[PDB]
Design a protein around this motif. Sequence first.
Motif, short mmCIF file in Angstrom:
data_model
loop_
_atom_site.label_atom_id
_atom_site.label_comp_id
_atom_site.label_asym_id
_atom_site.label_seq_id
_atom_site.Cartn_x
_atom_site.Cartn_y
_atom_site.Cartn_z
N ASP A 44 0.69 -1.16 -0.09
CA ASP A 44 -0.02 0.11 0.01
C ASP A 44 0.92 1.35 0.14
O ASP A 44 0.37 2.41 0.14
N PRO A 46 2.30 4.42 -1.29
CA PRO A 46 1.78 5.12 -2.31
C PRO A 46 2.65 5.12 -3.55
O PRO A 46 4.15 5.06 -3.75
N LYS A 47 1.83 5.16 -4.83
CA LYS A 47 2.31 4.73 -6.04
C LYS A 47 3.70 5.85 -6.49
O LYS A 47 4.47 5.50 -7.19
N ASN A 310 0.51 11.69 3.46
CA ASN A 310 1.19 11.46 2.21
C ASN A 310 1.72 12.91 1.73
O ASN A 310 1.97 12.96 0.29
N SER A 313 5.36 12.71 -0.63
CA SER A 313 5.13 12.13 -1.84
C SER A 313 4.15 12.80 -2.65
O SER A 313 4.49 13.12 -3.83
N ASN A 314 2.87 13.31 -2.23
CA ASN A 314 2.11 14.26 -3.13
C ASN A 314 2.98 15.59 -3.84
O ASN A 314 2.74 15.73 -4.75
N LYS A 323 4.50 10.92 -10.39
CA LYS A 323 3.03 11.48 -10.46
C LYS A 323 2.78 12.37 -11.11
O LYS A 323 3.45 13.45 -10.98
#
Length: 323
Positions: A44, A46-47, A310, A313-314, A323
Amino acid sequence: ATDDASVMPDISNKQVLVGYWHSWKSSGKDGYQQGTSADIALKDTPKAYNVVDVSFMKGDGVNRIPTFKPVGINDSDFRAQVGALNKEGRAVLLALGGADGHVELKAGDEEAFANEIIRQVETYGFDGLDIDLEQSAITAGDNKTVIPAALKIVKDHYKAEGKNFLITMAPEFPYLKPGSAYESYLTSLANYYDYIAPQLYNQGGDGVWVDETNQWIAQNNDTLKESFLYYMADSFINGTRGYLKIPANKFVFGLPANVDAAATGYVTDPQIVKNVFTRLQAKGTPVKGIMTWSVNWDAGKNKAGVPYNNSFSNAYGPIVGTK
Ligand SMILES: [Ca+2]
Ligand code: NA
Ligand code: NA
């Protein structure tokens, strides 16, 4: 007998967003500002994180060969989670060391350590190893020579079967100087390592002396964060101002996810990092990416119970293009 985890993803044409993943269970109020890190499953993550570093492979203070075993999940289920990341092109490394790592190899352990790294790969589907020694472990026992030696045996082993086993390091930045204990890791592994991510956190007022601006620029000085990041990168890229040489195409900024993840070094505005990326690229020396301690912190909560959501990472995923 291959499955999704049998692949070793190629990151050679990508910038990375690298996150450490805590394999142990959170203990609560573990943050530097009394927040709580999340118990997030590896699958899980984050991508935006295209490299995940599973923390840690460590010793026990009795025996000499470090090892890793996941907590509260069996081997086949853990591997399946590594496969799920691998299928999407995301590398999962095993991180060696950490605080209280008890990593202490002795001359003659290089082959047994290489064999143990190969059993980790075959068992869990890892794609590489990240050297993350605490200060005491850098020159403990024969670490300085055995760890490079073992890692070369492993890289060579996978290269024979067509695969690129990734080697990374996350040294604390003050140790990357000429004549430093740590220098021998870099020169021994000069043709083997994929990138180096100096930790630009928890080093207080250490930093860099810059003739251009006539200032000491400290890692815990928020007024000068833009200059810190730029001049630290420039120093590594050129091997100037007291620092060893790291090529920009193998240089990653190591930054803490938020104020709970580290004592100092949090970057308060992500535009600062974008300005540095932009300047470096204009000079023809764009860097390899960004690393953070930690995914679990990125998904954790502050002392008031407000989720971090997140936020790291965002913000930085888009800067490195994951992303
Ligand atoms: Ca794999
Ligand atoms: Na590359
Ligand atoms: Na390339």
